[PDB]
Design a protein around this ligand. Sequence first.
Ligand SMILES: C[C@@H]1O[C@@H](O)[C@@H](O)[C@H](O[C@H]2O[C@H](C)[C@H](O)[C@H](O[C@@H]3O[C@H](CO)[C@@H](O)[C@H](O)[C@H]3O)[C@@H]2O)[C@@H]1O
Ligand SMILES: Nc1nc2c(ncn2[C@@H]2O[C@H](COP(=O)(O)O)[C@@H](O)[C@H]2O)c(=O)[nH]1
Length: 269
Amino acid sequence: EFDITVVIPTFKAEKTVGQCLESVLSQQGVSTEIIVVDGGSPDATISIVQSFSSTNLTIISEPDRGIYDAINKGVSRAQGGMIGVLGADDVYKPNVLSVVKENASRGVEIVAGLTLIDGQLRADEQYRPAALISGIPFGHNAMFASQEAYRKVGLYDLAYRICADAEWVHRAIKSDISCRKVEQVFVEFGTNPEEIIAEACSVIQRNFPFLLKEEAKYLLYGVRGWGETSRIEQILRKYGHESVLFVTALQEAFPAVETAAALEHHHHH
Ligand SMILES: C[C@@H]1O[C@@H](O)[C@@H](O)[C@H](O[C@H]2O[C@H](C)[C@H](O)[C@H](O[C@@H]3O[C@H](CO)[C@@H](O)[C@H](O)[C@H]3O)[C@@H]2O)[C@@H]1O
Ligand SMILES: Nc1nc2c(ncn2[C@@H]2O[C@H](COP(=O)(O)O)[C@@H](O)[C@H]2O)c(=O)[nH]1
């Protein structure tokens, strides 16, 4: 097989898909498979991809139901031990694929790096319970996951057109999938905000079904620093009895509520 599979969903990416592919082929010291999942691009996208006649590139061009449908198709076919997803507007940094192969040899099922968004580091969060009341903790395109990890967790849920990656990672956390965060930039990155938020809140309720939508939004804003946090102790007392995982998530995310978390663990778990 291969050390790495890179799944590249494309639709009308003719402007950048050549730079994206160059950043993958420049990776040395790893056997790499590339699976381009195109949704029927009418521009030069296929003409450009076919310029990269690497004997380890696969082109899938057929109607799909959105990016995560296209991602699902590529992950399903991936024959590499570690699988990564690279948008056509993104580029891998030098040496990242060997860094992923190195950290995977120890058995870690997920290897995640840093993300450069407009020359700024994405404000990542830790892969831990506290992620479950937030969005995706690391950049999706900076994540690599083994064949086993996908086989354990499943595919991306097409009900989420934006944050299906966050939902998958939360399922990974909840499934105790091993993760090692590498403090190196893996990718340089190239949608209505309301829709982003709506999907993030729904993903959070999927971890903790007892939360009203407003309550999930308050937690997201509290963790992301977008809103206040005075009502965290209220939320904790209201639902702490439900899940030890929920109590763990809030005390990690909001260290100010530790003494209150102690009480929930004591009276309920
Ligand atoms: C509407 C908001 O505008 C800005 O404040 C932006 O920074 C916000 O993005 C942050 O919060 C949202 C929830 C995202 O989690 C975003 O991370 C990105 O979200 C995707 C969702 O799964 C991932 O595909 C992507 O790789 C990841 O970089 C960031 O944390 C928000 O848009
Ligand atoms: N296969 C497929 N790829 C898509 C679709 N929409 C966007 N993409 C690709 O997914 C990546 C995300 O870019 P975005 O459009 O989200 O900025 C890009 O590589 C883009 O070309 C789609 O409907 N189907």
